[PDB]
């Protein structure tokens, strides 16, 4: 009957598996039953009740010491956005850092009139980029250079427009008004059509490796094994030349050009998919049948979009545009909805990216701020100081040590033993200890050359690393802790800020 | 730490004699599990886990003080002053049952109750703490010139 | 001493925060024991008072260390004592320490055997009740 041989058989026996922790594989039917037909546990799940474990190896209970008040848990009473401590944002993925702020003005507030009493705001515009991918792309090419020269070059602007799907630029448009649905749909359709009429045939990436996430390890990913290969770069380049070999500088991406953004194709296809915005968001006249109704993203009648709701437009590679949304107010009551996800529409991703960070964007301040912030994750720092780096360009972490003022006393100054690090650089002691460290390193380089396709070369490099570590360690025990500090600062002030 | 051993032994004997044999050479991990559970305390069900310590305000019954018992006795002793088949099964003397409830009873047999329905059905600090820890309080609003009182919305 | 023994059912602190009414239950009204001194609130079909005295496996020779469910407060008979609190009553933190001791346990998950376990430390003894601290507003 109703696919009795097809909706049964446990959909290909549910031969797609997962992987939890210690290699245990579970079926998707089992996991779907766990989230669907196990609602008692879900009653606890939507109550944030604390339970606390017991120690299993203890004869007498003894509730295990936990600190569970994590950022998401404590933030459930806040409004708008959650709040973490940086380390918890480093965990739970959370790798899309903010690169720019903006606004979609109806009437732009003038500093004249009455302070700006004509300042009607339709949306608040924020742009977010994947910071590790921003580092890996814009940092190994545009890293260690003058940032003003980089942002002055029109090649950097072209590159941050081209590599936008690669960075996964997601734009959050938060409604600052009870906006009518038809007006917003017409405005977005008109703006995106205007930007589609100027989307010339331009450059897109091409795939260098297929597959990943086969239907047995849907929990797993291929990139850590790809980046921790026995030869890595050699293997990656070999894959590259067997398809699209990188022509650019140290960035990857082969960049096919022109035709990739076809005109009568995907551009016109997107000009039709935009026509199926006011017949997919505001269909035939019945404000209870319009898809976005009932949910908190609109009002009770569904006519207007409520103030505080946000629309998340993420530009995936291969022309994928993911439009999600999120209601406003208390985050403990916020509900997030996936609205649409289009794939293969290379004109939509390029048109949205041009509309946000183009030569004429929807907000020039947002485009300039995003293209200017992006060098901070490019230089291996992230937009917000999640790693608590003291040398951050903006929002640097402090050492937490009171600054010292030299007193006009004599009893405070004591001539103790060898318990001061060297602070005078360029002196005879520093120069002679640098010379002794130099001869120790030269002995290490000489000893690493006697340690005797690319996998055997990397094994030889590992053997040379072991011999160099042995010789350098013996030399550093011959020298002092000040020499250890000098080797540490020499290693620190020699690598590029990008981390290459 | 030998008391732990004797204790777990006692719990073992308890379960073994309580549930009719069923121990056997088999089910040894089950016996260890129930011994550990009864040693730690009482195994709660899910309904017992989500049961709130704070009772519902409608769940508090009335308990009359002595003056209110006197009012009841006066009202009952003031008030008044068909085929057997269809007659209800609860066909007793209403006045006699009412007066036999004004004496003895449950609402009238404390002799120490004082505003038992006005105190209670009212959140105290410990009950507010229990409700918040159970995730039952939606919003807390500090009010007053000293900000020492809250208006909790559950 | 009564607060540390968990023998206090209610603690009504008045507006001045220096005078308390201590509602301590009558002992046989402190828990569901089936003592005939109490009013027969709780009877089975045999017209017998219901006793809920679970034995303590850590102390079989001391019935006073056994476990018992506390009575419903509305069915309790309580002495209402008057206590003149000192001026450093909140600074000394005795009530704070009692509350922190009372709210530190209950409904602990046990991975060694499964199930949620209410620990014996979270349960009450024969005459031990849960202290209900209520403050009064002078306004």
């Amino acid at each position: 009957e109703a696919l009795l041989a097809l909706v049964a058989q446990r959909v290909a026996a549910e031969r797609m598996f997962f992987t939890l922790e210690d290699g245990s594989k579970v079926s998707l039917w089992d996991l779907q039953q766990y989230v669907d037909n196990n609602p008692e546990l879900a009653a606890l799940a939507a109550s944030v009740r604390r339970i606390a474990v017991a120690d299993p190896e203890d004869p007498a209970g003894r509730p295990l010491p936990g600190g569970g008040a994590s950022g998401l848990d404590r933030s459930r009473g806040l409004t708008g956005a959650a709040h973490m401590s940086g380390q918890e944002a480093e965990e739970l993925e959370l790798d899309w850092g903010q690169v720019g702020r903006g606004a979609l003005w109806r009437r732009r507030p003038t500093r004249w009139l009455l302070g700006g009493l004509d300042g009607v705001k339709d949306w608040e515009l924020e742009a977010y980029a994947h910071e590790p991918l921003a580092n890996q792309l814009l940092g190994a090419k545009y890293g260690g250079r003058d940032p003003r020269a980089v942002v002055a070059d029109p090649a950097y602007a072209a590159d941050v427009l081209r590599a936008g799907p690669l960075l996964g630029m997601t734009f959050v448009l938060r409604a600052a008004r009870d906006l009518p649905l038809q007006e917003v749909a017409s405005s977005w359709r008109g703006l995106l059509g205007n930007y589609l009429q100027r989307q010339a045939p331009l450059s897109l990436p091409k795939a260098v490796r297929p597959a990943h996430l086969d239907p047995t390890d849907l929990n797993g990913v291929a990139w850590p094994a790809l980046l921790s290969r026995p030869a890595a770069a050699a293997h990656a380049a070999a894959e590259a030349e067997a398809a699209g070999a990188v022509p650019d500088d140290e960035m990857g991406v082969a960049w096919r050009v022109q035709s990739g953004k076809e005109a009568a194709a995907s551009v016109a296809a997107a000009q039709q998919l935009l026509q199926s915005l006011p017949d997919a968001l505001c269909p035939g006249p019945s404000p209870a049948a319009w898809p976005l109704t009932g949910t908190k993203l609109v009002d009770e009648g569904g006519r207007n979009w409520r103030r505080g709701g946000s629309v998340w437009v993420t530009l995936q590679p291969e022309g994928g545009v993911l439009v999600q949304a999120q209601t406003g107010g208390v985050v403990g009551e916020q509900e997030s909805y996936l609205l649409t996800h289009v794939q293969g529409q290379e004109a939509l991703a390029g048109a949205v990216m041009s509309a946000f960070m183009g030569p004429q964007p929807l907000d020039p301040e947002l485009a300039a701020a995003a293209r200017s912030v992006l060098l901070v994750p490019a230089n291996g720092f992230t937009a917000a100081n999640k790693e608590r780096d003291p040398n951050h360009p903006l929002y640097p972490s402090f050492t937490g040590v009171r600054p010292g003022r030299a007193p006009r006393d004599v009893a405070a100054y004591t001539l103790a033993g060898g318990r001061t690090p060297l602070l005078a650089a360029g002196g005879p002691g520093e120069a002679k200890l640098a010379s002794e460290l130099r001869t120790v390193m030269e002995a290490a380089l000489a000893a690493a050359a006697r340690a005797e396709e690319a996998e055997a070369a990397e094994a030889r490099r590992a053997r040379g690393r072991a011999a160099a570590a042995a010789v350098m360690a013996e030399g550093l025990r011959r020298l002092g802790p000040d020499a250890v500090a000098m080797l540490e600062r020499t290693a620190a002030e020699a690598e590029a800020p990008q981390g290459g | 730490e030998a008391a732990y051993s004797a204790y777990l032994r006692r719990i073992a004997e308890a379960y073994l004699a309580e549930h009719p044999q069923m121990a056997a050479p088999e089910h040894a991990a089950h016996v260890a599990r129930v011994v550990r559970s009864r040693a730690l305390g009482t195994p709660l069900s899910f309904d017992e886990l989500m049961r709130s310590a704070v009772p519902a305000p409608g769940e508090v019954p009335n308990r009359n003080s002595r003056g209110q018992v006197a009012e009841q006795v006066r009202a009952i002793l003031d008030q008044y002053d068909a085929k057997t088949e269809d007659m209800v099964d609860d066909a007793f003397t209403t006045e006699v049952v009412e007066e036999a409830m004004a004496l003895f009873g449950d609402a009238n047999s404390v002799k120490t109750a004082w505003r038992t329905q006005e105190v209670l059905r009212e959140l105290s600090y410990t009950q507010l703490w229990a409700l918040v820890g159970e995730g039952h309080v939606a919003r807390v609003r500090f009010y007053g010139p000293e900000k020492n009182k809250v208006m909790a919305t559950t | 001493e009564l607060l540390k023994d968990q023998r206090v059912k209610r603690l009504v602190v008045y507006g001045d925060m220096r005078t308390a009414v201590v509602e301590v239950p009558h002992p046989w009204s402190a828990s569901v024991l089936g003592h005939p001194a109490t009013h027969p609130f709780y009877e089975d079909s045999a017209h017998n008072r219901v006793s809920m005295l679970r034995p303590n496996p850590a102390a079989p020779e001391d019935v006073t260390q056994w476990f018992c469910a506390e009575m419903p407060e509305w069915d309790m008979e309580k002495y209402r004592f008057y206590v003149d609190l000192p001026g450093d009553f909140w600074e000394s933190g005795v009530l704070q320490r009692h509350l922190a001791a009372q709210r530190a346990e209950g409904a602990v998950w046990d991975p060694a055997s499964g199930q949620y376990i209410l620990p014996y430390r979270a349960q009450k003894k024969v005459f031990q009740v849960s202290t209900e601290v209520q403050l009064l507003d002078p306004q």
């Binding site: 609602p39 008692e40 009653a43 | 069900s45 899910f46 309904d47 017992e48 989500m50 049961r51 009772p55 769940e59 019954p61 449950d106 | 569901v32 609130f41 709780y42 009877e43 089975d44 079909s45 017209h47 219901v50 809920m52 469910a69 419903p72 069915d75």
Partner: peptide, 26 residues
């Protein structure tokens, strides 16, 4: 019976049906 008239009703034992009323009904 009386063992439900008081023992489980007045004494607030028998916690409210949440698992059964959520799985079998809802």
């Amino acid at each position: 019976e009386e063992l439900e008239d008081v023992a489980v009703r007045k004494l607030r034992l028998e916690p409210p049906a949440l698992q059964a009323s959520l799985q079998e009904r809802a």
